[PDB]
Amino acid sequence: MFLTRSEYDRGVSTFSPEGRLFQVEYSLEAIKLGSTAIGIATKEGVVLGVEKRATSPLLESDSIEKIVEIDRHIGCAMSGLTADARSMIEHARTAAVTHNLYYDEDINVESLTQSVCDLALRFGEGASGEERLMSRPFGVALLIAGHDADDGYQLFHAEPSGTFYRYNAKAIGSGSEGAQAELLNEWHSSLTLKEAELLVLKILKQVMEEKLDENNAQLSCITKQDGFKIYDNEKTAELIKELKEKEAAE
Amino acid sequence: IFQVEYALEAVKRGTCAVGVKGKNCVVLGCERRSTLKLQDTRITPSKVSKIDSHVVLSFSGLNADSRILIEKARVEAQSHRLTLEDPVTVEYLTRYVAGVQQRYTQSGGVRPFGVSTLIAGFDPRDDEPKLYQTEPSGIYSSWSAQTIGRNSKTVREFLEKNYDRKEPPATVEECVKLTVRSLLEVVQTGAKNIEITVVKPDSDIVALSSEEINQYVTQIEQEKQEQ
Amino acid sequence: SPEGRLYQVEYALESISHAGTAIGIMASDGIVLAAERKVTSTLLEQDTSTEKLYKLNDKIAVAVAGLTADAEILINTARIHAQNYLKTYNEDIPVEILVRRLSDIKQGYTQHGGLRPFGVSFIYAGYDDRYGYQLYTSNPSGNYTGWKAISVGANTSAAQTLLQMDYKDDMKVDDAIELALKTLSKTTDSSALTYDRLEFATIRKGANDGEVYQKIFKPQEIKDILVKTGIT
Amino acid sequence: MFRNNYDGDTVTFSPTGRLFQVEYALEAIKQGSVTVGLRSNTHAVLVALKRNADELSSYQKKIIKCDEHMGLSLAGLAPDARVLSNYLRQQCNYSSLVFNRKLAVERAGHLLCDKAQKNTQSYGGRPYGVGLLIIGYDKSGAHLLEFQPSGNVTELYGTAIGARSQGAKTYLERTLDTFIKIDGNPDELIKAGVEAISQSLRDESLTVDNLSIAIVGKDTPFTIYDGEAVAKYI
Amino acid sequence: VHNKILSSEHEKDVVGVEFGEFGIFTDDQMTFMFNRLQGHLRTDGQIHSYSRTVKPFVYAINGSKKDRFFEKLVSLAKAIETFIHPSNNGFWTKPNAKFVHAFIKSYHGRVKYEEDICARGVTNGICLTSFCHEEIVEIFLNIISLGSQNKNPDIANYYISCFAYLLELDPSNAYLIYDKILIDLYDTLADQFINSRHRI
Amino acid sequence: QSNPSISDPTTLLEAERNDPDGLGLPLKSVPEKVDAYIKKQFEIIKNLEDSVVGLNPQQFIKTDYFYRTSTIFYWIKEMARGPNKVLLVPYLVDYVLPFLIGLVKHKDVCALASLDPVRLYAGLGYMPIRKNHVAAIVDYVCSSNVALSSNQTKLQLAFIQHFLSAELLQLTEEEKNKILEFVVSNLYNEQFVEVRVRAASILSDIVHNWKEEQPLLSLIERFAKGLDVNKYTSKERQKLSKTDIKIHGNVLGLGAIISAFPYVFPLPPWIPKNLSNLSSWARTSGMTGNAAKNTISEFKKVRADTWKFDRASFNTEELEDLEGVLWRSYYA
Secondary structure, eight states: OOOOOSSSSSSSOOOOOOOOOOHHHHHHHHTTTTEEEEEEEEEEEEEEEEOOOOOSSSSSSOOOEEEEEEEEEEEEEEEEEEGHHHHHHHHHHHHHHHHHHHHHOOOOOHHHHHHHTTTTTTTOOOSSSSOSSSSEEEEEEEEEEOOOOOSSSEEEEEOOTSSSSSEEEEEEEHHHHHHHHHHHOOOTTTHHHHHHHHHHHHHHHHHTTTTOOOTTTTEEEEETTTTTOOHHHHHHHHHHHHHHHTOOOO | OOOOHHHHHHHHHHHHEEEEEEEEEEEEEEEESSOOBBBBBSSOOOOOOOOOOSSEEEEEEEEHHHHHHHHHHHTTTTHHTTTSSSSSOOOHHHHHHHHHTTTTTTSSSSSOOOEEEEEEEEEEOOOOEEEEETTTEEEEEEEEEEEEEHHOOOHHHHHHHTTOSSSSSSSHHHHHHHHHHHHHTTTTSSSSTTTTOEEEETTOOOOOOHHTTTGGGGGGGGHOOOO | OOOTOHHHHHHHHHTTTOOEEEEEESSEEEEEEEOOSSSTTSSSSSOOOOOOOOOOOETTEEESSOOOOHHHHHHHHHHHHHHHHHHHHHSSOHOOOOHHHHHHHHHTTTTTTTTOOOOEEEEEEOOTTSEEEEEEOTTTTSSSEBSEEEEETHHHHHHHHHHHHOOOOOOOOHHHHHHHHHHTTTTTSSSSSSSSTTEEEEEESSSSSSOEEEOOHHHHHHHHHHGSSSSO | OOOOOSSSSSOOTTTTTHHHHHHHHHTTTSSSOOOOEEEEESSEEEEEOOSSSSTTBOBBOOOEEETTTEEEEEEHHHHHHHHHHHHHHHHHHHHTTTTTOOOOHHHHHHHHHHHHHHHGGGGSSSOEEEEEEEEEETEEEEEEEEEOTTSOOESSSSEEESTTHHHHHHHHHHHHHHHOOOTOHHHHHHHHHHHHHTTTSSSOOOTTTTEEEEETTTEEEEEEGGGGGGGGGO | HHHSSSSOOOOOTTSSSSSOOSOOOOOHHHHHHHHHHHIIIIIOOOSSSTTHHHHHHTTTOOOOOOOTTTTHHHHHHHHHHHHHSTTTSSSSSOOOOOOHHHHHHHHHHHHHHHHHTTTTOOSSSOOOOOOHHHHHHHHHHHHHHHHHTSHHHHHHHHHHHHHHHHTTOOOTTTTHHHHHHHHHHHHHHHTTTTTTTTTT | OOOOOOOOOHHHHHHHHHSSSOOOOSOOOOOHHHHHHHHHHHHHTHHHGGGSSSOOTTTTTHHHHHHHHHHHHHHHHSSSSSSGGHHHHEEEEEEIITOTTTTTTTTHHHHTTTOSSSSHHHHTSOOOHOOOHHHHHHHHOOOOTSSSOOSSSSHHHHHHHHHHSSSSSSSSHHHHHHTHHHHHHTTTSOOOHHHHHHHHHHHHHHHHSOOOOOHHHHHHHHHTTTTTTTEEEEEEEHHEEEEEOOHHHHHHHHHHHTTTTOOOOOOOOHHHHHHHHHHHHHSEEEEEHHHHHHHHHHHHTTOOOOOOHGGGGGSSSTTTTGGGGOOOTBOO
């Protein structure tokens, strides 16, 4: 064993000799160390699943809200400090209604996402030019998924750093490095919602190294027609039962 | 930034606090060392704190820290009735309390609270019991029953193996029957150690006294020895 | 705050067990306050200060054990809360409400950890027509507690013991005046107790009716009750 | 080993006369993808190589419109360019409203220099960490500017910033007298901007998703070509 | 045993205590104390006054059967290597320093006691050779050079004071040390370190 | 019952003298009639593996198999603490480590009755092991039955990383190898990408105490044969980088070697020439080309303060070749 250490570790909002901002490079590793969360996009809807991880029969699951509505057409899933994202969501719900008021239309998923990033982009304790009023990078990553009529169904990864990518299917949290390399294998431009409802489970089964039920998984989706609904425990189960069978195929 | 976990420690060390849902009623329970001989008995028996006419709240932690919460809440409880004419819902009172302990970390850089709290009661009109728990982080959870505090783990273990959802303590009387047993495990003398409050549908909150608490302990340890 | 500990607090909570020594005894028909005075020089002007016994309102008073310049900052703002609750509800402020009002400012620093905690620990003696006579305590922890008899400062742990011993619930007021002096027999680093090392106070059932007189003792009145045993 | 005592913040001059915190930022440029810029007497072109995350993700946009006469490309820290590209968008739109005057390119140069400079006087804030190639057609011809986070904005015929910037910076250096004479041809000046950005690739292959191009000048307002629109140049 | 073997009376009733590879120690006895000392400097920091803790290792060297021991010392320096680096301070930076000094005091200690005896005619092949002094410098030179730049000036004065002890052995290596030290110094007087206080 | 109180001092020292390790007797040795009891409690729990033939976390905490198992665990936790360690060792190889890794026996069952197995199994890497016990333990890990477990693999792999740190300098170059040939057989295991990486991060702990230059330079070669040159033309690297495991390993491995020499104060010329072989690959987006960017940023970082100088041993304008390398979402 042995110890590697740079002299510019630690440094808060100051550049390493490379141009790296280690305070924020680390902000980004702690997504890899929270609850699992997975999003997949079809041409027939978008699916978001997470890991519940109930720690008792008492604690009635469902106070475990790791997937929440934003407007009827935009949902997001979160991995990490669920408590630290209360404010991040308030701002997104507030921005989406505010847009609906000022303009009489549902707000573009691309721009709803960018607005949330523009919020965690106010990290600091000393800014001249424009003021960024807050204290620390926002300690939570987001999968934001919804539908507008310009650019079909969409999936987005909002990072604490204030930037984002639009993945066609993404995984974040404890299993991500592995779940991600599995989605990268099993995703095609022609999935059906039924097919992806299930692939999200198969990949939660894998990177949880366990057998799963409605006490440890929550499924949700967002269709053009029905909006953004979160599957109640019954539906999540005969979706699970439906995999126990599909994989007993060969 | 780690100071959160440290505060969560003070939780541990403090007056032990419990709570228990029922078929249609709810109960809390908690406190500390009888009386140091010479202390005034009749002027701080403020174990569980009334928030509205239908909502109560106990805590494990720094007693001097709770008060700042039991107020900011007792207030938003009115400032909701006032700007929306509608008593606060037990989830909302809870989400507001927890949401405050949360904002006592991530801005300005100030210290977080040395309390976990339990929050019980019935929403307005609706007669479905509600029980929640908060902690210095900003996390709120709903429980069929729970405890937080000192030797709280002994109790959470007891309860898990004594409560079942299939059949919740329906009787008003018997729902307390249980909450007592579960603190006798961790106390340090008995009835003289921890007391209880009881809220039933529609703003009917009736806290229990010393004499009703010993028509219980001394009707428990009767059935006990019978082997 | 490592193990669940309030460090900057214990710092000042034990800085208290250094300065001063104060006592409160609640009788059935009165209340009693008392304190020892800091290391005195021959030339310090005894009668003026009233340095560790302050009046808050005509019906409430506190004994101090802590840094003087620090308690004055508190007391100044508590004498005001009293009067705001008058001008507002035209009733005299209830003791618990005043105590809590302070305890809440103490705990204000015990958390907005950008300014330094309070020296000072209080015994409050007050009467309000809701809860008879009252005796309260105020460490910079933020906590307050009810007391039939109490003490703060140096030699604290010691007096609490003699007190526990000679106290009876049926106690009169004069009986409790003694118990207070008597048990500053022990808890005195100065061998032999004088009228000038002292400051005293009473809240009795009035010198006349069914009401409430308040009385911070003048030096002579002390050397008079000291006469009952202490020194003669 | 060799510690540094004068690289703590921006309010601190190294003994040899050096603001280390700025030299470090000037390096964040090279931590992002390569982009190229060049101009004739009648047009200005930009070529950027959008970089992706997975095979499964979109590509980072590297060109942003500023007004109908001016645009820029970024290499480096994204948010820092979102912040600066926005400020530019404002002054442009203020010179339009108050004076009904397209905001000079030579002047947005002067205005960004001063904006970035502010972040190197102040204790607490870090410098800007991105480079910008800015293009436009103003009342005075075609134009190209290089914006380093130090404040130094410099006007050029062509340059390149970022990851392996050096491959193109050396092509353009040799092509000089050839491309600045590509007047009245638009398709041909982009053919050049792309044959230059491709000196800075290894065995790497431009596609419809890799390539991002923008152009402006005389009678062409700033337009951006991503996706299939870029195919004709591959 | 070492003291007694030399010059005086090689006995005390028994020269029936053989030296060899690893002092008076088994192969496994030596092996154990090495991984225990490594345990101390890398994991559990459990040592006090080190002069005492180092003895066994110094007085297990055999001038004519080193090799197998120096093999064990080198891998102990290659382990310890990273923990001396100026920007890896921790619970260990004391133990590694107070040891790398205690060991080179307690080695030079021995050498200057033997060279006092080969001023009495008695070489003994147990004695430390010119080639031990060589492989000692090979080992602790990057180690000593890293420690001396350490952020704590006391923890540095330990690694820096080892140069004097090594040079007294007048090893063939002597130049390697004078070479570093003189560049480091001439650079400093030419202000090539002006950005870094400690190097100067 | 573990105090060894013997008859004579003489009878005693003759037992210590005749021990396998040039060292001594296990101080405190659990007496047979008890070694029997304990062995029973472990093999009574193996009898009941049918008891949870298929139940769930809720119908688990209620079975007898759990109750036993929980008690045994709490016992192990309290043996590994304090003066009882020398008592606990003989049981690891056959009993305590096969157990504990009762964890694919359900991850979520542990979260419930809060038990941290991961933290104990691995915290048993350090401890009072004796010359002969090392043997059987290295043989238990590096198991040819290994292939048995699944992401409890990144567990045995972390137990090794700790053993090594507490049995380094005490491992016979034989053992020091049985380990390294296991670690390396994991940079390649089809299926789990999770572990190919935890393996490489560990292979460096080895190659740090490995200064002898022919064990070393003979790895470097073993790895850089699966990549070197433009074995394949551009279009292909893209395809391979995303799927081929034999090449993920080769680049993870060659990556660890370079990250095992953090500060060689003047830089070894095998590092430039072998980052160069690694740079044409960190230019490919995929799964290996990713963990090859790790290796070049990890490096460019720790070399930071010695860089004023390291620049000069990079004639190769493959200085340029190292500029991409680190990319996160906030860079463009």
